[PDB]
Design a protein around this nucleic acid. Sequence first.
DNA 1: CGGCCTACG
DNA 2: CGTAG
DNA 3: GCCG
Length: 326
Amino acid sequence: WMPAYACQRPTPLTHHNTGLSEALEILAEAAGFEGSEGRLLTFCRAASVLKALPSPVTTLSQLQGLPHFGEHSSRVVQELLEHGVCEEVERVRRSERYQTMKLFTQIFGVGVKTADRWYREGLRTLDDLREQPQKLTQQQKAGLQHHQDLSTPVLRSDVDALQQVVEEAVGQALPGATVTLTGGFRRGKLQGHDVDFLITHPKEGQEAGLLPRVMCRLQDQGLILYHQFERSFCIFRLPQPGSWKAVRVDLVVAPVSQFPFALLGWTGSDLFQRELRRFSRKEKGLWLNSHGLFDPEQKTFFQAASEEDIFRHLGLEYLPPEQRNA
DNA sequence: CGGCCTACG
DNA sequence: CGTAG
DNA sequence: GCCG
Ligand SMILES: [Mn+2]
Ligand SMILES: [Mn+2]
Ligand SMILES: [Mn+2]
Ligand SMILES: [Mn+2]
Ligand SMILES: [Mn+2]
Ligand SMILES: [Mn+2]
Ligand SMILES: [Mn+2]
Ligand SMILES: [Mn+2]
Ligand SMILES: [Mn+2]
Ligand code: NA
């Protein structure tokens, strides 16, 4: 009917229940801030079910039988339908705790546990953090230094410019190596928090050692403001007319044997991939990550040449990236 | 009861 | 701990 | 919070 796992149904980028899903996602985020990943996941799964529906929900009746809707999520929807507002959601969004945890966790290098410690210490603003720089890692220092730019949506023109300089550096580092745009932009998003790239080479093994060489070539062109291997979480100095802006870029290398798995994982959405890995293990007895798909009884890895091969093997109807917006 | 994705830096 | 989708 |  409505399948229970998000990887079993198409979720388009544009859907029909934004008001309801956004309210449930507030509660999910707040559950995360209080350290309950289980409640976070339920609220995100409920919100995702609404994104997959073909029409607006207008009456409580339409939730009957939907997976991940129980008493709490149904009451939130009921109050939004009846009153236009959910008291619990409004109390969360106006709370000092929620607003400060959101502010701090949005910083690159800061998660819930760090944000919660700072909150318990009385810190409330970005200026509070900057005044106490000894309590910051180098990663957090970079996230705070570039926070304004990193809060500006990344546009497609930015993606295209970044893809060009990444392709130039990759080609200088290793002839024949390829760059694939992944992440939300591959799912059709028009804006993003960052740009994700996946790099490989058609000859297994030639990509060994590639990422440090790419990073050196980008840094020699003055393109790198921060970096810290096979995954590089960077901040680039992106030229703009007369100036520049900082942009988060993730660069990932995989051998071609792993490419379909890495492409699938890095294309998301986050919830889609968590649900796909859960489905794989719990329903099919196979272990999925961005490196492979492992049968733990035969002790063998599935050889995939495409994302479609992975969906088949898991017994799932193929979904293109633009239907993975769970 | 107890799981909730599964990696790398 | 942080990062990722 | 929901569900296997
Ligand atoms: Mn539609
Ligand atoms: Mn409740
Ligand atoms: Mn009422
Ligand atoms: Mn991204
Ligand atoms: Mn690896
Ligand atoms: Mn990214
Ligand atoms: Mn329990
Ligand atoms: Mn993400
Ligand atoms: Mn509980
Ligand atoms: Na963060």
